[PDB]
Single-chain antibody, 226 residues
Framework: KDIVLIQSTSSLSASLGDRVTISCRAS??????LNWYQQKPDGTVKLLIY???RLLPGVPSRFSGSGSGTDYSLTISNLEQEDIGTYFC?????????FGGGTKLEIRRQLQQSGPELVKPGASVKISCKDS????????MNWVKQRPGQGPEWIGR????????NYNGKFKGKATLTADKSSSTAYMQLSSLTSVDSAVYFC????????????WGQGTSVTVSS
């Protein structure tokens, strides 16, 4: 079994200025390889904390991370408006990378992806991700699935340099990852689509830390019609 990540609280509201603390739990000691992403109401994703407690450039100091072994947490010392969205943890100890179920936080009382697609059941789609950055061929391009309400799912990755890939077993016969160095574009084809495939798919890069995706595409929504 892949390491399961749990975020016991899936919905929490609070007032501005409030101290907010979100818990993440792993089914096995993930040796401090734990990250936290923020997804704003518009669906965009961002890596906030990596390796349990390291803030990424530009994150506000009101964010911190704690924990070890199997128990981790994210804390916002005083909630701000821009802090609204959903928070997902993710383990980077063993492939496939797995994410928690997300915690939607509310207030009480370079990666350029292709457009949305609508398809009939059983049809296939090939979507793209153009990276304007200089590390396209020297980084890993990861892909993530997000069904409305569920936690993201790491589908697999590809190293544009030599075309090597690493898939999540669940999507092996489902996804085919390819890239193009001359155009700095990573492609993902999803075959024989079912209603279970309707979702938003993200491309996200990693390089310095293969388990933490620090740059994300805006996401492409694929809908498998009735």
């Amino acid at each position: 079994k892949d390491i399961v990540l749990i975020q016991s609280t899936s919905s929490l509201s609070a007032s501005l200025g409030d101290r907010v603390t979100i818990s993440c739990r792993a089914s096995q000691d993930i040796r401090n390889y734990l990250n936290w992403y923020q997804q704003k109401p518009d669906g965009t994703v961002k890596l906030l904390i990596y390796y349990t407690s390291r803030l990424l450039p530009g994150v506000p100091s009101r964010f911190s991370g704690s924990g070890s072994g199997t128990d981790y947490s994210l804390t916002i010392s005083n909630l701000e408006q821009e802090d609204i969205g959903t928070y997902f943890c993710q383990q980077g100890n063993t492939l496939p990378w797995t994410f928690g179920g997300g915690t939607k936080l509310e207030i009480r009382r370079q990666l350029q992806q292709s457009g949305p697609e609508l398809v009939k059941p059983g049809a296939s789609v090939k979507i793209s991700c153009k990276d304007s950055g200089y590390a396209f061929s020297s980084s890993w391009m990861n892909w993530v699935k997000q069904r409305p309400g569920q936690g993201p799912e790491w589908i697999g990755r590809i190293y544009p340099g030599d075309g090597d890939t690493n898939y999540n077993g669940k999507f092996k016969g489902k996804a085919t990852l390819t890239a193009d160095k001359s155009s700095s574009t990573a492609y993902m084809q999803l075959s024989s689509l079912t209603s279970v495939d309707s979702a938003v798919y993200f491309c996200a890069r990693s390089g310095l830390l293969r388990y933490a995706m620090d740059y994300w595409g805006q996401g492409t929504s694929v809908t498998v019609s009735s």
